[PDB]
Amino acid sequence: RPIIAFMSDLGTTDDSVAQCKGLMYSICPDVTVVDVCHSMTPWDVEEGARYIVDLPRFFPEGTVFATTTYPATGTTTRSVAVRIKQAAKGGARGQWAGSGAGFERAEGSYIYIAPNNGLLTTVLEEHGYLEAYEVTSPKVIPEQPEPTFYSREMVAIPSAHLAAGFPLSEVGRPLEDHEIVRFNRPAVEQDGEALVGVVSAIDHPFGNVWTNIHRTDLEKAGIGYGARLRLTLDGVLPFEAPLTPTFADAGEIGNIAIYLNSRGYLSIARNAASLAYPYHLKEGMSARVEA
Amino acid sequence: RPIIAFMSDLGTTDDSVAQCKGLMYSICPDVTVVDVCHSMTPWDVEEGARYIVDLPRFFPEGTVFATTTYPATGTTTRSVAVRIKQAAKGGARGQWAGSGAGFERAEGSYIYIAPNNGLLTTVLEEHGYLEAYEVTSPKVIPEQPEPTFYSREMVAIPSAHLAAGFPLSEVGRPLEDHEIVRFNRPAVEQDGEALVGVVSAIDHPFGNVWTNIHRTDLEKAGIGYGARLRLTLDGVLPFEAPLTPTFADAGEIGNIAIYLNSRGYLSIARNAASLAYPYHLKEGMSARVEA
Amino acid sequence: RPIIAFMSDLGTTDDSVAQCKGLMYSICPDVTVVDVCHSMTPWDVEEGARYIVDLPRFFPEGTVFATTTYPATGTTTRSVAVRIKQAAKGGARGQWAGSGAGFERAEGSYIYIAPNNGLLTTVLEEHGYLEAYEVTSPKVIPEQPEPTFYSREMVAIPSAHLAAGFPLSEVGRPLEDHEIVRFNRPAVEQDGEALVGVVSAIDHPFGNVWTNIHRTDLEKAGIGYGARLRLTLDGVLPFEAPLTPTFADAGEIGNIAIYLNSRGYLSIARNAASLAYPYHLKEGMSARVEA
Amino acid sequence: RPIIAFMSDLGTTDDSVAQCKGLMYSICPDVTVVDVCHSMTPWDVEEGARYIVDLPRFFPEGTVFATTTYPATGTTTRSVAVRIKQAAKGGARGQWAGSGAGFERAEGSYIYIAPNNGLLTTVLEEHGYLEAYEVTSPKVIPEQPEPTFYSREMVAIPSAHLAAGFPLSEVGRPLEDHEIVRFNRPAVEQDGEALVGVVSAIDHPFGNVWTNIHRTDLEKAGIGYGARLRLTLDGVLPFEAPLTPTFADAGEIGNIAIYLNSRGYLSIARNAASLAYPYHLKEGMSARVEA
Amino acid sequence: RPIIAFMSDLGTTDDSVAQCKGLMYSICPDVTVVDVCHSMTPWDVEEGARYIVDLPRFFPEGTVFATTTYPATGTTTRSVAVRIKQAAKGGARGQWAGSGAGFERAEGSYIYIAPNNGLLTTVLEEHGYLEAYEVTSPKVIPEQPEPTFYSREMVAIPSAHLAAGFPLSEVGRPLEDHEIVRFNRPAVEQDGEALVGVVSAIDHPFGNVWTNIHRTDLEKAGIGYGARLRLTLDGVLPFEAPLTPTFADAGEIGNIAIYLNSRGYLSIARNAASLAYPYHLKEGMSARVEA
Amino acid sequence: RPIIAFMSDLGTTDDSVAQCKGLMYSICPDVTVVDVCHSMTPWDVEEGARYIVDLPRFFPEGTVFATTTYPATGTTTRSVAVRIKQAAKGGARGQWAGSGAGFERAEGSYIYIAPNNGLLTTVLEEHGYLEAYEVTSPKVIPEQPEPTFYSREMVAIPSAHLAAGFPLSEVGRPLEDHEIVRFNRPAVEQDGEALVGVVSAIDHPFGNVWTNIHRTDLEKAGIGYGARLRLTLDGVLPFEAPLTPTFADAGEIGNIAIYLNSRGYLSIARNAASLAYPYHLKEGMSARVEA
Ligand SMILES: CN(CC[C@H](N)C(=O)O)C[C@H]1O[C@@H](n2cnc3c(N)ncnc32)[C@H](O)[C@@H]1O
Numbered sequence A, B, C, D, E, F: 001r002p003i004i005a006f007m008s009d010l011g012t013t014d015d016s017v018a019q020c021k022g023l024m025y026s027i028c029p030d031v032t033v034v035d036v037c038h039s040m041t042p043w044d045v046e047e048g049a050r051y052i053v054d055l056p057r058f059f060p061e062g063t064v065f066a067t068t069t070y071p072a073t074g075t076t077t078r079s080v081a082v083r084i085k086q087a088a089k090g091g092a093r094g095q096w097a098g099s100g101a102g103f104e105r106a107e108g109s110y111i112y113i114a115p116n117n118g119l120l121t122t123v124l125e126e127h128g129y130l131e132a133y134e135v136t137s138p139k140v141i142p143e144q145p146e147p148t149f150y151s152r153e154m155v156a157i158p159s160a161h162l163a164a165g166f167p168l169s170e171v172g173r174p175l176e177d178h179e180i181v182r183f184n185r186p187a188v189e190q191d192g193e194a195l196v197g198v199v200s201a202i203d204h205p206f207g208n209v210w211t212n213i214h215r216t217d218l219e220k221a222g223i224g225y226g227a228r229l230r231l232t233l234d235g236v237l238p239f240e241a242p243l244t245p246t247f248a249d250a251g252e253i254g255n256i257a258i259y260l261n262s263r264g265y266l267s268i269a270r271n272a273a274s275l276a277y278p279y280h281l282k283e284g285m286s287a288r289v290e291a
């Protein structure tokens, strides 16, 4: 029962992902391959990062995360394979996932394999890591890798060797911290009483609006449930709602809800209606909150 | 070899379904998770119902159906879990599904777990039920459920415990019939000789048109295969064809076929062309039929 | 550990695929069902063949390929089931898939089951076959098949039996070669010294442009890597670049790459930018290439 | 130098308007035909009234306003022709139009000729009338009018006669006030101290938002220039700004301006940027304003 | 008091029409320039013809029609200038236009000037002509015409000289009939009892549907006002209504009306709703009619 | 017979332009008002400039050009009224407009009145000017101008006083050169043998592609008709055609034509087909030409 959770930019409109899965079953016959999603904006490492950072706590320990967008495919670049440290609690409150008090996950229990292009930036900062390796061994990758399909050659193939029990430390040399590429994560700016950030994503298929203002940012300003907030979107939209746990707390259908989403971030929405879709609100718009 | 069949409004554009699956594999190591679909219109209980009602006869006995759109997520509402009575024949003819004479399914062989918001209305009407329970036991749900993710906390998680052998009767107290929420199903109206109903769904990806006029409505009007019919849509666009078993019976490509779809309902299409898409025909438009 | 790899025109918007899968697990409890894709243009047998021709070398031996668009559903037409001969190398170069030197596949190791409507044309061409059978036995298909769902009745259901070790030769009588329906794939012509083909596909989600001009057409025109090419699309949009192994060979982000794709065909792209989407480039547009 | 100012739902995509104009020049060789607009939503009598109510103070005395949407063309309905009383001041302030102190207009100086379908409702309200006649005389309309072109037959043709000095009282019998069809224009209500109206128009091509909240509603709520206002559109999008004379009062390009428009109504805009288009704001959406 | 009526494909999005007008006012100081329309599909001679054929009876005698789409601009081609014979009655009934009994127009009273590219095909068929000349004299056209602006050089300019009194016979040599280019007009075909033709135009801005089935085609089939008809469009969508003079005869708003439009052609609409726009009905679709 | 040629950003979808025209006929009863166009992108002074720079040679001397986009409406800014110097030849060759050798225009014969916002930048540089005045006199503008309608108050009103014969020098004080606001006109860059500029506009309704590379730029490189050119659009589209006078010179319909447009600028198009529309080519894309 080893598991590979597969997140790519290959789409679901042809056999690309299927080619990867075939090789995964060829290499690790008893594997379960779980699709994260294959629908990310290609080459957008910051977005792919979002789909992979919250994963470990939800999976049984020993799960391998094969995560890939590879614009540098067919170059001398090689992937990185990391064993993370903290599985890490998540959500609005910061807790373990599961029934009861949740399923506590041990440390050093998940492997991420990805292009060394910054895709694992937030995984590394939010979980830490115990070890990190360049993926170079002809035992886990092709000697002649397909120039335009490194998402298969350099992620999917070796992830299945790792899931079969190939020793992580044998995929290639240890990587020093600085050799692991990171993208810049823009910071939430304290601006007087206000916290100033950005709309980080539109929560599809609902049209909810997610910000990069985390619960840790809020509580450092002393903002918890009940706080009457002004959340200004796009510079000109001063929404006004108390912070509430969930959508229905806005009252009637269509009413504005300000809440902490399931990833732990300040968000805004309408109760059982779309906020973002009718007004064509977008990722990257400004987002400011204050009491 | 347990199965959970998972129908949600979570989409496939981020890791939401994957989080649910990870937890299901965590609780039930031997489980196969089968995706039904995740693309339904959020908060549309009637549409979600369409995707789940026809499923039992196709699945092995003991299958759990985890089915969720959750607009009341984070409120005091709790899920219902039901053991259905009859697996129920289906199709245009009413038969068991599978090779040969079909696979006959024993009574009481499927469980649905769902928000108690009306999603199971047509499940209960067409399959009946033997027992129904409120889902409240912290052995099957989180002690501290994520306010905005009840689809995972109150459906995916306890569905995996049920797959894993947790006694159905122990999830919570029994629910009496009037405690199970139901949506209203508009009836097919008789109008002299005409049967008057609705376009219930556009059949994607083909653009066939499905009505809520059932084969039983037709055979009580005396209408059977070979009958010449006038089927009028949106009030303005009429169509004339004999009633035929299939699309190619219309003759040339693009010719109007009027038929019974695989769910047992009167439908209209073009032979290997799209009907709905060029004329922008939509669900909710009226549908009138008469010999 | 039997595998069924499943390609259809059923979509992922309702329960259609799940109904097939449920019957697959019913017949073959052991089975792993792998989705290829379900998003193909309904009834486009050439597009469907594209999503299935390159699969075998990637999969474990014994894999059954359930591949289906069925616009003749409900007619006297019966499916064809074939055991292919060569797994066949693929790629820009022509190699076995996998780590190290790749994994060689024994001959006669895969079964395709599909409508006899030409969908397997390129599979048969590129792989050959050892045996081909009409699928008629009530042991593998329903005695009374659903008229509008032959993709389930005549492909999905019998594919699961074949995965379960049902003898291929026992599905029905042998089919002679002339009874296996084919489509004609237009040839790559020569206008003087230029190669005149077609855009065979837009490569989603990247927007890359794929032509029907194969490696072997290039090498018999004396076109090798490094050759400066003019490629004109749709008879008006000209593009110029060396033939290179990959996208990054183009240099700056956005620059034109002319390359061989992972399927072995002359393709054209922007480096980590979309070519097709901004210019609304389409499958079926002409592609001419000159040195 | 007679003038006919011409407003219709005829469009500018075929020869319809030119056919009317040709007949106008035929009857009144002297005439100047001025287009108001021909792009109104067909059959929307409220929108049409908007394009004609503010015209008189701008035009030379004696001007005939040929104003027409005619969804009842071809019926026994006959047009109404009225001589209005007050030319009426307009604008954000309420002034005469023109250079210096403006040009005063004598009373009873303009004729409107239109279908008796409510199109002149606001014209009659804001201008009053001295006389109103049914248009029936064969001297001014065709003996056998084109059934589908009453905008020409019953408005354009008789308007040219009236421009040519045909006696208004001789077009047909006097109409009593109750025989002149009106629409009801919804009032601006008061929810506590907030003013609750509607978006009356998107102001093309700028994308400005126009409400039905007039200067006089503002001044009887004690709202003057400089007052800080919260204006919410469609029940969810909030905007905040002082009431100012113009767009540039907002400051930076893109900043919210809340202002009185040239027609005298509370409006909202971005300064030299579009407000409506990015947010897909629409006529008919609710508008609430609070101090 | 001369008039030039100006129909072009120049659009109204820049100064192209204004340049033409300036020159027309320059040549003919006393002229009124009446815009017909400028929005026709460029290079569509058949569509351009529709906008000009019905015009003469509406205009004063001596009017010049300057009508131009010019794909052969800058070539050796030269315009044709024609004095038509009969002004021709029109409408659904066939009558003179105007008040009273209509304005009867004398023979030989209108000139059309146009590219000799077939634009005047239906002008000549319906009005006849008395004389036709090639436009070549440098007294009416530029000595050095702008290669890409023949609509101005070879139509607008000489149209103004003709308005200004330049002898028609002096523009260039006479053109014999076979020297005047004609487009082919597909005939209305008889098919048993049905009349089979085409959707000739969508009637913008309303979305009414116009066919090329003339009233004469109807009255030779015995069809008159009150006849119950089945009118089928695009082959698939049929419609049933009596033939009525106008829209409101269909009864309720949105009801199907089948009528004769103001150009004398069989048409189909909804009563004060759009037919074409919701169902995306287009010009070129087939149209079949029968009692 | 005085003429006002009116170019605004007011659109044609309401009565805005009509309000201006009414005041024009009120102030100058014998005026002819010619519409240039009212469809420019609001506040885009560089585009408005394009619609007004080529005008004078086409109009009779003494014509007044009322040209306006006024984002600074309701501020202390006042318009500028200029008498230009050279009427200026135009077109592919640089010639006078009209029949024969064209209509030669005297110097000092046209007045432009516009916002002092840079709209007259190219008018001034291509025609020069003899005098320039601030428009401030209450004899030609309102004492209380409508804050949001300066296109009427500050352009349309005083243009009609000027057309009536109000002395230009009496509208307000003389303006020094530096007080006349100019926008930056980016230069065509000589880059080796290449001329490097930009796509200046899409020529609607055709989809022709206009560049800012003028005939004077070309001939300074020695490029005339016949020159085999490479015109690279958008960095990646190396079109190849000889420079020819007109579209048809490309040969068959759809073929690429490179030519000098009627404004004197290097352009590219297809013969009687659209270049820009199918490929979504846009203003502001790079444009490079070379031999
Ligand atoms: C939000 N869904 C979780 C996935 C989400 N992308 C996340 O990562 O938190 C869970 C459930 O919330 C419900 N939901 C989502 N948005 C709303 C909303 N605005 N109002 C009411 N219910 C909502 C949906 O029915 C869905 O089943």
Ligand SMILES: CN(CC[C@H](N)C(=O)O)C[C@H]1O[C@@H](n2cnc3c(N)ncnc32)[C@H](O)[C@@H]1O
Pocket (backbone or CB within 6 Å): B203, B204, B206, B208, B247, B248, B261, B262, B263, B269, B270, B271, B272, B273, B274, C009, C010, C014, C016, C042, C043, C068, C069, C070, C071, C072, C073, C148, C149, C150, C151
């Ligand atoms: C209709 N498909 C079943 C899924 C469908 N949503 C259902 O629930 O019945 C099965 C097969 O019917 C074929 N089909 C669907 N619509 C048409 C049509 N209009 N004409 C011809 N074939 C069709 C498709 O190729 C598909 O493989």
Ligand SMILES: CN(CC[C@H](N)C(=O)O)C[C@H]1O[C@@H](n2cnc3c(N)ncnc32)[C@H](O)[C@@H]1O
Pocket (backbone or CB within 6 Å): A009, A010, A014, A016, A042, A043, A068, A069, A070, A071, A072, A073, A148, A149, A150, A151, C203, C204, C206, C208, C247, C248, C261, C262, C263, C269, C270, C271, C272, C273, C274
């Ligand atoms: C191309 N992908 C393979 C699937 C493809 N449909 C095929 O069948 O070859 C593999 C990787 O190539 C990368 N890729 C695709 N297109 C481009 C491009 N135009 N520029 C740079 N990288 C690209 C993607 O990030 C993806 O991870």
Ligand SMILES: CN(CC[C@H](N)C(=O)O)C[C@H]1O[C@@H](n2cnc3c(N)ncnc32)[C@H](O)[C@@H]1O
Pocket (backbone or CB within 6 Å): D203, D204, D206, D208, D247, D248, D261, D262, D263, D269, D270, D271, D272, D273, D274, F009, F010, F014, F016, F042, F043, F068, F069, F070, F071, F072, F073, F148, F149, F150, F151
């Ligand atoms: C608003 N225009 C008047 C027509 C308007 N439809 C009305 O009836 O008031 C006049 C001038 O105001 C300017 N204008 C319009 N909207 C804006 C805006 N949002 N910001 C700055 N200027 C604007 C335009 O450039 C135009 O020349």
Ligand SMILES: CN(CC[C@H](N)C(=O)O)C[C@H]1O[C@@H](n2cnc3c(N)ncnc32)[C@H](O)[C@@H]1O
Pocket (backbone or CB within 6 Å): E009, E010, E014, E016, E042, E043, E068, E069, E070, E071, E072, E073, E148, E149, E150, E151, F203, F204, F206, F208, F247, F248, F261, F262, F263, F269, F270, F271, F272, F273
């Ligand atoms: C180009 N038209 C002039 C207006 C243009 N906006 C200009 O300012 O030069 C003049 C005539 O050229 C013809 N024309 C324009 N573009 C093409 C083309 N690409 N191919 C053939 N004819 C064309 C049209 O029919 C039109 O009547």
Ligand SMILES: CN(CC[C@H](N)C(=O)O)C[C@H]1O[C@@H](n2cnc3c(N)ncnc32)[C@H](O)[C@@H]1O
Pocket (backbone or CB within 6 Å): D009, D010, D014, D016, D042, D043, D068, D069, D070, D071, D072, D073, D148, D149, D150, D151, E203, E204, E206, E208, E247, E248, E261, E262, E263, E269, E270, E271, E272, E273, E274
């Ligand atoms: C149809 N209009 C004539 C122009 C038309 N393009 C023609 O050439 O006949 C005249 C009047 O008929 C009315 N009209 C047009 N279509 C409809 C319709 N479908 N229902 C009711 N009234 C209509 C319009 O309001 C318009 O003012």
Ligand SMILES: [Cl-]
Pocket (backbone or CB within 6 Å): A205, A206, A273, A274, B042
């Ligand atoms: Cl929604």
Ligand SMILES: [Cl-]
Pocket (backbone or CB within 6 Å): A280
């Ligand atoms: Cl958008």
Ligand SMILES: [Cl-]
Pocket (backbone or CB within 6 Å): B165, B166
């Ligand atoms: Cl237990």
Ligand SMILES: [Cl-]
Pocket (backbone or CB within 6 Å): B280
């Ligand atoms: Cl739509």
Ligand SMILES: [Cl-]
Pocket (backbone or CB within 6 Å): C074, C075, C076
């Ligand atoms: Cl059969």
Ligand SMILES: [Cl-]
Pocket (backbone or CB within 6 Å): C280
């Ligand atoms: Cl498109």
Ligand SMILES: [Cl-]
Pocket (backbone or CB within 6 Å): D074, D075, D076
């Ligand atoms: Cl009548």
Ligand SMILES: [Cl-]
Pocket (backbone or CB within 6 Å): D280
């Ligand atoms: Cl919209």
Ligand SMILES: [Cl-]
Pocket (backbone or CB within 6 Å): E165, E166
């Ligand atoms: Cl003369």
Ligand SMILES: [Cl-]
Pocket (backbone or CB within 6 Å): E280
């Ligand atoms: Cl369309």
Ligand SMILES: [Cl-]
Pocket (backbone or CB within 6 Å): E042, F205, F206, F273, F274
């Ligand atoms: Cl076009």
